[PDB]
Amino acid sequence: PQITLWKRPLVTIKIGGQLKEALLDTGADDTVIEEMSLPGRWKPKMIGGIGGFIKVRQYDQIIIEICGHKAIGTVLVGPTPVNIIGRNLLTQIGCTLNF
Amino acid sequence: PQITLWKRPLVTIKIGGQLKEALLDTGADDTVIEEMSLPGRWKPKMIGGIGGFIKVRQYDQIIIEICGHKAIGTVLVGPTPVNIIGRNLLTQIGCTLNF
Ligand SMILES: C[C@H]1CNC[C@H](CCc2c(F)cccc2NC(=O)CC(c2ccc(F)cc2)c2ccc(F)cc2)N1S(=O)(=O)c1ccccc1
Ligand SMILES: [Cl-]
Ligand SMILES: [Cl-]
Ligand SMILES: [Cl-]
């Protein structure tokens, strides 16, 4: 699809068999989602935002569907204001910015 | 142009007669630039997200040039860790997400 930016680019994602809403964010290096249970071991990670840095849990090789497109990669879990799909997964689904 | 997301989508912008590097961020509602002087009236605003909130100065009707494309809109100025071109100005240059 072609998504304009007059409104927030919110799409449906599927992770752990559950549908959630997430923001497609070209300004985020990584994908970060609100608290939920993910399988496997996690590693520590710090991510920096507008207001400073936060600690998150890093899960690797997580299956996630984004607007119907399959991705498998790193998902961070932490106290984010909204679920965010960052460049690590936007590249997997072949997303580009065009003007 | 078509910009891939293998690395941060950093572009050169021209604002207040200064050349600056800024991130094209579909996850940002507003455009926020590091401390600089801008002409006209301003009002305080709080913007937030990962890490919490920061106080910024809101300047309206500011002209920006992004990749040769002129756009006018509100520009927030404050202690952001990176200059961000948010949706309020990405729409004006006809920027879309495509996959
Ligand atoms: C550097 C950029 C890159 N991601 C976007 C974000 C924009 C911040 C921003 C601006 F810059 C300029 C003007 C406004 C704002 N804020 C919003 O638009 C609010 C928004 C939001 C989005 C992501 C957040 F994390 C936090 C909040 C929001 C959407 C839906 C909702 F219901 C409630 C809030 N920042 S970040 O937090 O630092 C960050 C850095 C690394 C990874 C993730 C995020
Ligand atoms: Cl990944
Ligand atoms: Cl505006
Ligand atoms: Cl349009």
UniProtKB/Swiss-Prot annotation, chains A, B:
The active site is at residue 25. Residues 1-5, 49-55, 88-99 are annotated as: Dimerization of protease. It comes from the Viruses. Residues 20-89 form the Peptidase A2 domain. Aspartyl protease that mediates proteolytic cleavages of Gag and Gag-Pol polyproteins during or shortly after the release of the virion from the plasma membrane. Cleavages take place as an ordered, step-wise cascade to yield mature proteins. This process is called maturation. Displays maximal activity during the budding process just prior to particle release from the cell. Also cleaves Nef and Vif, probably concomitantly with viral structural proteins on maturation of virus particles. Hydrolyzes host EIF4GI and PABP1 in order to shut off the capped cellular mRNA translation. Homodimer, whose active site consists of two apposed aspartic acid residues. This is Protease. It comes from Human immunodeficiency virus type 1 group M subtype B (isolate BH5) (HIV-1). The chain holds residues 501 to 599 of 1447 of the full protein.
